[PDB]
């Protein structure tokens, strides 16, 4: 009970959400807790789109601590786009709270149909300041600045479907979340939570690769040439003209990711990047791996990675701690 804990609810083993409150009356909202962006936004009661009809809305008039901003802002994600205006109000996360600058959202049409199809209301950013729109100091950083917490760090312990729940911890590291050694890796930039690791998949090896730890992505992305090289010759089959590959679950040819550094070694087994589809045959599965090319060769470590590894995000020390997550409690 020493640190701040936000319980994470698993969504069908593919996603996970975390709740937080806005306004001095604690208006509840379901958030995607995202280490891949650095902005917080909620749908407003002034929302004019159909999606907002199925979500929890933010009423500025009901909040004594609401401060009008009104600055128009248009958030562009990879998945879609939401638009609205800036507003300042009391943001409550767990047992902590602070006056914060967020985005009241009026238009969610650019975020459809993903928005309506999903159960979350908004997105909460957990990245660095330079990643944020409107130059907003990260919420944990500001929490340390206001001496609400001792250390400006937050840890992710992801849930497992029909097993145990998850936790986002602010203020410190809890021993119960991991077993084995906790190995830190320095950030190569104060932007994303990105670290440098050597990637190894069977014969394929890409050294000094840029790895981004992204909780807002439910897949592992890899350079396209890397993926192409690593898929042959596994008995995997490509969905017709869809960018997804499928195979039998008992496929022994399936390799293991090995991200190695001078500090530590982290691996990802087939059981972590395989999703289950049809129960026909002996288990049909989909590879949760996406080919993605950036100017700098980049691996994106999404939900699959973090579901294996308890992760620590340290603003003060500018680094990412990785430990094997404790199997049960
Ligand atoms: C509708 C969500 C889809 N979904 C679940 C499917 C049911 C995902 O797992 C998912 C979420 C996102 C996403 O927008 N992530 C952003 C945050 C976010 C999350 C959900 C919805 C909307 C926004 C950002 O945090 C992305 N993070 C960065 C910027 C690092 C990024 C950039 C490019 C590609 C992947 N990730 C991106 C992806 N992609 C994966 C491979 C190639 C392109 C995009 C997948």
User: Could you give the CA distance from residue 259 to residue 204 in angstroms, rounded to a whole number?
Assistant: 12
Domains in the chain (CATH in brackets) are 1-175 (2.40.70.10), 176-329 (2.40.70.10)
Straight-line distance from the first to the last Cα atom of the chain, in angstroms, rounded to the nearest whole number: 15
Ligand 1 atom 22 nearest Cα: 79
User: Could you give the CA distance from residue 103 to residue 39 in angstroms, rounded to a whole number?
Assistant: 8
Task: Please indicate whether residue 220, judged by its CB atom, sits closer than 6 Å to ligand 1.
Answer: no
Annotation says 214 is catalytic: yes
Cα-based distances in Å from 78 to 82, 114, 170, 217: 11, 12, 27, 10
Structural biology method used: X-ray
Could you tell which of 79, 218, 302 is best to mutate to test the pocket of ligand 1, judged by most ligand atoms within 8 Å of the CB? Answer: 79
CA angle, 326 then 6 then 309, to 5°? 30
Task: Please indicate whether residue 239, judged by its CB atom, sits closer than 6 Å to ligand 1.
Answer: no
- 4, 10, 19, 34: the active-site residue: 34
Residue 132: which of 83, 190, 46 has the closest Cα?
A: 190
């Amino acid at each position: 009970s020493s640190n701040d804990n936000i319980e994470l609810v698993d969504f069908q083993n593919i996603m996970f959400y975390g709740d937080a409150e806005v306004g001095d009356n604690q208006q509840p909202f379901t958030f995607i807790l995202d280490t891949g962006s650095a902005n917080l936004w909620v749908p407003s009661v002034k929302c004019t789109t159909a999606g907002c009809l199925t979500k929890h809305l933010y009423d500025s008039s009901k909040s004594r601590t609401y401060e009008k901003d009104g600055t128009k802002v248009e958030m562009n994600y990879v998945s879609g786009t939401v638009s609205g205006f800036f507003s300042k109000d009391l943001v409550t996360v767990g047992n902590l709270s602070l006056p914060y600058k967020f985005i009241e959202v009026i238009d969610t049409n650019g975020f459809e149909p993903t928005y309506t199809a999903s159960t979350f209301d908004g997105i909460l950013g957990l990245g660095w300041k330079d990643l944020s729109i409107g130059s907003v100091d990260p919420i944990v950083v500001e929490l340390k600045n206001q001496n609400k917490i001792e250390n400006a760090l937050f840890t992710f312990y992801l849930p497992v479907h029909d097993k145990h729940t998850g936790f986002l911890t602010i203020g410190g590291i809890e021993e119960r979340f991991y077993e084995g050694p906790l190995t830190y890796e320095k950030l190569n930039h104060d932007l994303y939570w990105q670290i440098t690791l050597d990637a190894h998949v069977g014969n394929i090896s890409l050294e000094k690769a840029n790895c981004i730890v992204d909780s807002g992505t439910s897949a592992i992305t890899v350079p396209t040439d890397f993926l192409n090289k690593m898929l042959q010759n596994l008995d995997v089959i490509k969905v017709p003209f869809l960018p997804f590959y499928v195979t039998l679950c008992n496929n022994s040819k399936l390799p293991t990711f090995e991200f190695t550094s001078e500090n530590g070694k982290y691996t990802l087994e087939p059981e972590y990047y395989l999703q289950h589809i049809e129960d026909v045959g002996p288990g049909l599965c989909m590879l949760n791996i996406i080919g993605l090319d950036f100017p700098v060769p980049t691996f994106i470590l999404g939900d699959p990675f973090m579901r294996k590894y308890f992760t620590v995000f340290d603003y003060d020390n500018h680094s990412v701690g990785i430990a094997l997550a404790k199997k049960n409690l």
